[PDB]
Amino acid sequence: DAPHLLIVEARFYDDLADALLDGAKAALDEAGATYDVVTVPGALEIPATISFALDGADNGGTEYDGFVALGTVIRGETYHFDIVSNESCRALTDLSVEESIAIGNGILTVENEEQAWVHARREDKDKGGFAARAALTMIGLRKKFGA
Amino acid sequence: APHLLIVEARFYDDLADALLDGAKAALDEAGATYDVVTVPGALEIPATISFALDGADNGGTEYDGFVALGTVIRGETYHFDIVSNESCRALTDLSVEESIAIGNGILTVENEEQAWVHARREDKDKGGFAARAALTMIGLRKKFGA
Amino acid sequence: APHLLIVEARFYDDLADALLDGAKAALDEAGATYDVVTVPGALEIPATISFALDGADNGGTEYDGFVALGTVIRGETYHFDIVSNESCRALTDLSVEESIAIGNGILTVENEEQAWVHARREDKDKGGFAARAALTMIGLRKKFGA
Amino acid sequence: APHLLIVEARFYDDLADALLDGAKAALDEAGATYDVVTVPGALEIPATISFALDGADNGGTEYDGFVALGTVIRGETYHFDIVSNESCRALTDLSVEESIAIGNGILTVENEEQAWVHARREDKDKGGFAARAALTMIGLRKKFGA
Amino acid sequence: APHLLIVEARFYDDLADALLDGAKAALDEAGATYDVVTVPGALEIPATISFALDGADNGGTEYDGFVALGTVIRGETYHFDIVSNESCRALTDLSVEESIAIGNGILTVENEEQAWVHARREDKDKGGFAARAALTMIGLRKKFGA
Ligand SMILES: O=c1[nH]c(NC[C@H](O)[C@H](O)[C@H](O)CO)c([N+](=O)[O-])c(=O)[nH]1
Ligand SMILES: O=c1[nH]c(NC[C@H](O)[C@H](O)[C@H](O)CO)c([N+](=O)[O-])c(=O)[nH]1
Ligand SMILES: O=c1[nH]c(NC[C@H](O)[C@H](O)[C@H](O)CO)c([N+](=O)[O-])c(=O)[nH]1
Ligand SMILES: O=c1[nH]c(NC[C@H](O)[C@H](O)[C@H](O)CO)c([N+](=O)[O-])c(=O)[nH]1
Ligand SMILES: O=c1[nH]c(NC[C@H](O)[C@H](O)[C@H](O)CO)c([N+](=O)[O-])c(=O)[nH]1
Ligand SMILES: [Ca+2]
Ligand SMILES: [Ca+2]
Ligand SMILES: [Ca+2]
Ligand SMILES: [Ca+2]
Ligand SMILES: [Ca+2]
Ligand SMILES: [Ca+2]
């Protein structure tokens, strides 16, 4: 009866990933929701992964009520940092719309590691918790609208 | 009488109130009805409209149009620019792909000051503008017989 | 003679008049006829063309092409490059997905000065260029027998 | 022998000539045949390829590949970035979604000086590079038996 | 034993070799096999994977995953961000729409220096990272039973 979420975490920056995951798990536990955690190398493969889960579900696999995308992108000198954020979020958005699924976006895109922590920590901006809660809210709306 | 779904990303509460106030006032004056659904951020507004559409296709409330409200204030983190681009990008695709009337009231400003200049109905009234746009689009949807 | 639908985003009233004047001159000059539909902003131009396409598939007016007109001036707020990007993005995709003739006259400028330099038929004439591009695309569409 | 469609966005005539010369040369050298269709700007190149594909699916000329030729020179207007992004973005989706071989010779430069360095066959020969890329992709299209 | 398709955009030959060496080393170390196909630039990598997918649906080599390798160095021209943007964008959509395992080794850097810091297996080894990312995705694709 409790929603079962799939947390797809891009573990590029491990310590930041743990902050986000701790934020997300905290919010889900707190809400009485259960979850599975899957780790991917970077934000770029987060959408594909949710896609794998959806197709998996259609093949009798675990059926997730929603998803929590966790990740961190720190703009350094390279332009690929803009690309990771943009493409991962872009694909997630399209995904949430095209598949009409509940997705909490916890993909952090900051200038430096200092703000990354400010957003990743549950003690701070708690983006991971905000994302997990966002997924729940969307799970509720998805249910309300009878999508 | 058109019945709209107002989807507000209530990130900044005060601003959200201003925008919603603008949207509601504009629709009231046009004699249009509406429901208000709340989401945490602009990023979930498009999926929300999607939910509404699927629900409608499942016998649920059928909406004539949508008013998306939200506010994104660019501070320091590169995270603000993405919220604006995606939400509005997704809304644009959605309006086209689904051929629906969408008033885009997702405010993307530099700082809180201009946010209020745009959010307040006494000012630029972005919320009202978006609501009116939805009505205009609802009318065009009907004129072309879409 | 080709019959085009001119979809103008009337945000800046005077600049819209300039683009519209430019678009009409080019079409009148070419002998093409047209209807003009007005929307509040560039963001609703793609959906409007979408409405017209579905309207036509429902026995409504069949347009040979489209001329999208609009102007976005990048001021101080971040709510400008998004309008042009998304409006143009959806227009391009629409032209490919639906294989239709679309003249893109959505003007994206840094300031009011270039807006006028591009919007005036007497100058850059962005509207006429878009109108002419639409006609060109109508001819190519027929030439390829698409 | 592969037969390709060169779609040239002829906005800057001289540069267009340089790019076209480069593309034709590369195609001639490879013993490939080609048709040339001209469009006003890079923005209509993707729809044009789309017209040709639908045309082909209606018994029209069947092309083995495409060579998109164009030039965008970034100056002041933000519309220059849009043309570059949109045309190239649509071409890419088109190459993927339709599984066709496309050589991208849409030159996006800062100034005219570098435009010539890239456009001239004697120089960087962007046109020939795009023509050669199209050929390469045609061969690959066949190697995979897609 | 997974069989991957390495699609390398060989624009800067030496850097391409660094990335390929990094990709093969990672795949050989995992016991995975692979075929290597060369394209002229990052813009054709997505269409190439598309070719491989179709070819597979026509009884061609069935790949368990893909490793996209390439390098884009941002200079003065704006044609650099577009190559990285579109290629990566196309790859991302492809991986989602086709539910395929794709390791993105398309290196987007500002200068030759970071290009070398990332392409060398001895250093950041983006080629190996992409290859390993592809393997991880292959494993996940199977764990989820997609
Ligand atoms: O999640 C992230 N992934 C990153 N890797 C890119 C991509 O997400 C994939 O892991 C890999 O490129 C191949 O799929 C990042 N950077 O490279 O900087 C980053 O900041 N964040
Ligand atoms: O509506 C907004 N949402 C924001 N959050 C992003 C997103 O809309 C979602 O709430 C959440 O990311 C997970 O879905 C914002 N910022 O982060 O700055 C903002 O300014 N405005
Ligand atoms: O056509 C324009 N519409 C604008 N409005 C945005 C949008 O096009 C819609 O009118 C409205 O947002 C709700 O749909 C603009 N700005 O806001 O700056 C602009 O410059 N040009
Ligand atoms: O090919 C180009 N077309 C341009 N026109 C834009 C577009 O390609 C179409 O021609 C027209 O806008 C209507 O579709 C350009 N600029 O405006 O600068 C440019 O630099 N290059
Ligand atoms: O892989 C790359 N291809 C490049 N060429 C662009 C494109 O990838 C194709 O090779 C060609 O344009 C025709 O499709 C690059 N630049 O132009 O700079 C680059 O840096 N990297
Ligand atoms: Ca750790
Ligand atoms: Ca009809
Ligand atoms: Ca001046
Ligand atoms: Ca045929
Ligand atoms: Ca097969
Ligand atoms: Ca250095």
Side-chain angles (χ1 to χ4, degrees), chain A residues 75 82 85-86 89-90 93-94 96-97 100-101 107 109-111 115 119 127 130 134 138 141-142 145-147, chain B residues 5 11 37-40 43-44 46-48 50-52 54-55 58 63 76-79 82 86 89-90 94:
Chain A
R75 167 179 165 176
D82 290 58
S85 304
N86 291 312
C89 292
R90 172 187 168 298
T93 290
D94 281 15
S96 72
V97 164
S100 285
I101 55 178
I107 296 176
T109 299
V110 297
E111 244 66 51
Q115 43 190 297
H119 293 283
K127 183 73 167 180
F130 189 82
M138 292 302 274
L141 290 183
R142 192 195 187 199
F145 287 106
Chain B
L5 169 62
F11 194 75
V37 61
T38 298
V39 298
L43 286 189
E44 28 284 342
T48 299
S50 185
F51 293 168
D54 285 337
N58 286 171
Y63 294 94
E76 301 181 303
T77 306
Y78 226 65
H79 187 294
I82 288 185
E86 286 315 292
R89 170 180 156 288
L94 206 49

Side-chain angles (χ1 to χ4, degrees), chain B residues 43-136:
Chain B
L43 286 189
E44 28 284 342
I45 293 172
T48 299
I49 293 175
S50 185
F51 293 168
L53 292 173
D54 285 337
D57 293 312
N58 286 171
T61 310
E62 179 73 61
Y63 294 94
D64 297 307
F66 307 83
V67 182
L69 306 178
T71 296
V72 179
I73 308 181
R74 166 173 162 170
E76 301 181 303
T77 306
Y78 226 65
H79 187 294
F80 307 81
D81 188 53
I82 288 185
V83 180
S84 290
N85 291 329
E86 286 315 292
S87 57
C88 303
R89 170 180 156 288
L91 289 183
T92 307
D93 288 68
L94 206 49
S95 71
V96 168
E97 253 152 276
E98 300 300 313
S99 289
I100 54 180
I102 300 183
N104 189 321
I106 299 176
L107 199 55
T108 306
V109 289
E110 214 65 61
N111 51 55
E112 179 173 54
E113 182 189 300
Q114 43 189 294
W116 284 105
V117 177
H118 290 292
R120 292 183 55 184
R121 173 170 57 67
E122 301 68 48
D123 254 294
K124 297 294 183 179
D125 181 35
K126 181 70 171 177
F129 190 81
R132 281 185 283 284
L135 291 170
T136 293

